[model samples]
Target chain A: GHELPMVERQDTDSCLVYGGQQMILTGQNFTSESKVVFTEKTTDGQQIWEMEATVDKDKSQPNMLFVEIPEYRNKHIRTPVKVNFYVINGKRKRSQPQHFTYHPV
Target chain B: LPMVERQDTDSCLVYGGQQMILTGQNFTSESKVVFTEKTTDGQQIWEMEATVDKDKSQPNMLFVEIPEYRNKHIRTPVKVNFYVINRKRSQPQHFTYHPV
Candidate 1:
């Protein structure tokens, strides 16, 4: 239930959106152990949006993974995504190399 | 940093800076990973040029944004300059992290 927050590329290109576009991959270090990875598939792989992500909570600071690309590929919108992140103390995967790709139209 | 071992019912979660599916898998036609982007002052600012696809389902498994009309973005955190071609032709590959 903590630590997997490391997403960047809001702008340097490939914040890539299109399919019912309402984009925002803006992230910052969150605590209580984070859990918000996005990547249906794209390292040259597809299927990155079956659609399901909503967690926004920041009393002082640290929270933002609010997403909306749902329509579930309603006739091809934009699929490329990557959010392979990790860090779950007792439950560990220790992943790190946050990615993003959801270019719609 | 090549380490991926899977045993799935669909659970591989992530959420540090959540761009936003953080994890789920049927994965492996040829599943692979290697992307590098730097410039918080780390210098080297792009490297997303390594792709091998078989197929996954949605988009093309990841075809992304195509009603066939677009502006073009989301290439996947690309920065550039970290080529591996297809090593083991003879054994010659370099770059740990540079250009800072």
Candidate 2:
């Protein structure tokens, strides 16, 4: 067993977006060595988000984090899709299913 | 400050059109709830106004109707931030606008 950290949206709304600002994932028990993973759904045994989120750990808050939401498939589509996110400390932790959307440039 | 007791779920989950009821405490006649959708970069900003129900409204409870969309065709969902603002108080809550 592990400490089993918890993760949640820094704000009330979801954070996953296309080419947006740094998303703040807030929770407890975090460190600079923590890892953040953003995953996309798989269809026909293929990964939807080939190159997913680029994680960045900031030491500003022990209970907060800022991550890079990498641009991915259908960033121009107006429709939103659900995805999963997890934080890795000593143990892997997850937040609720998040909604991600993109805007037209 | 009105204390919110309801969650934005399947019914209250906003898109653009349709009237919605928002329940809370400490609501007054002058208090207004504004739904705002803005990009992280602050490039775009959208507003949706909810009209408060006077007949069934009270200091601790009130009803509201969700308004129309600023953009007709928003292909993707946008982050909508909202709050309760009155002459005496203002409180913030995080909300989102999904595509219909």
Candidate 3:
């Protein structure tokens, strides 16, 4: 059985919405195949945007991973947009969501 | 800043002119609902603004009429995207137009 990935903390909590920034996450049971996902939700808990973050395998360790944040394409994002960030290791096996925010450029 | 949670209806006839109640956050009297559709290659091909019922609107709800689609003679259902704008844009919601 695969160990469920656990994310303890993120290096940063916010970035510019144009995105291209790298975020480091410290966690447990991280594998090279671990993927990070970001989801933006509405006030009523509806998902508005979801995307996968690109991982830097060379810079990642079993306890930590470096990932590049994807650019937000919504043109109307002039203010800060809060999103849920988490790690996935296997099918339906994902870490608890952490709050991350994207700010206007 | 505004956010759309859901709408009262997601589908209407191609002839359009249906009223939809969208529930969200930070809605205001100046909020506008814009409908848009893109081409297969990602080019925007259709865009229109829906009329809002300001008299019946609230800070967390809005009443707007669905506009007609660009092509009313289509044989299949068409899916389009819409969002609420109050100085800034909200996450888009999906709407479908069924053919008669």
Candidate 4:
């Protein structure tokens, strides 16, 4: 097993604010135990909100992770908001962040 | 909300073992089709659950195998009512089983 995970690219970079869409992340060293995390950060680089997106184990491959986008916590976003996504394989083993956007309804 | 627009077919043989595709909205993995029938006296006669094909099912479509009727040897056509149930039940639809 590799010690570190890598996320090269995502199938889609945006989803609706209600967010039930499934997205695919293609990269390297993904495992069945890997979990996708979504985070919202403040302008000063502070973590404000985070959630663990549901991974589709049946459709996921070693190099491709299938995950469901979680709804944006802030319901009043009148415009699109950028968020960070990463894969966590184990303790202290996290992949580089990828950018995803949630569009307002 | 789960809503069934129409089924692929409305009738089957009296043997009543076949597959029917229902097109609708808000279908989920937890959705199931329930069939029911009543006697002339308004007493419930038949109630069964159709097997839902989760692999082929989607948010707007469902594939279900119609279960065997309680009386497969009927000499006349039997009309039954069925509905899709997810978190909520959809409106009833009609199905007919014809004798050979």
Best by DockQ, which number? 2
Per candidate, native contacts kept equal 0.00, 0.00, 0.00, 0.00
Q: Score the docking of each candidate (DockQ).
A: 0.02, 0.04, 0.01, 0.01
Pairs with backbone N, CA or C atoms under 3 Å apart (clashes), candidate 3: none
Give the per-residue lDDT of model 1 (tens digit) for A1-105: 333343433332244444333334333344444444344555675645444434343321242333443333333655644443221223443334444444545
lDDT of 2 at B26: 78
Q: After TM-score superposition, what is the CA distance of residue A1 in candidate 3 from its true location, in Å? A: 39
- How much is B88 displaced in model 3, in angstroms? 1.0
For model 1, state the Cα shift of residue B51 in Å. Answer: 3.3
Q: On residues A28-93, what C-alpha lDDT tens digit does candidate 2 reach at each position?
A: 456666666656676553446534455564443556667776665565555565555566665444
For candidate 4, lDDT tens digit of each residue in A5-59?
7564566879889988988876667899999999989999899989999999998
Off by over 4 Å in 3: A1-105
Chain A only: list TM-scores of all candidates: 0.23, 0.62, 0.91, 0.95
Q: Each prediction's Cα RMSD?
A: 20.2, 10.7, 16.6, 18.6
Candidate 2: list runs displaced more than 4 Å.
Answer: A1-22, A25-105, B7-17, B42-44, B87-90
The parts of candidate 1 lying over 4 Å away from their true place are A1-3, A6-105, B1-26, B30-34, B41-44, B53-100
Q: Is the docking of candidate 4 incorrect, acceptable, medium or high quality?
A: incorrect
Instruction: List the pairs of residues colliding in candidate 4.
Output: none
Better of 1 and 3 by TM-score: 3
Worst 10-residue lDDT window, candidate 3 chain A: A1-10
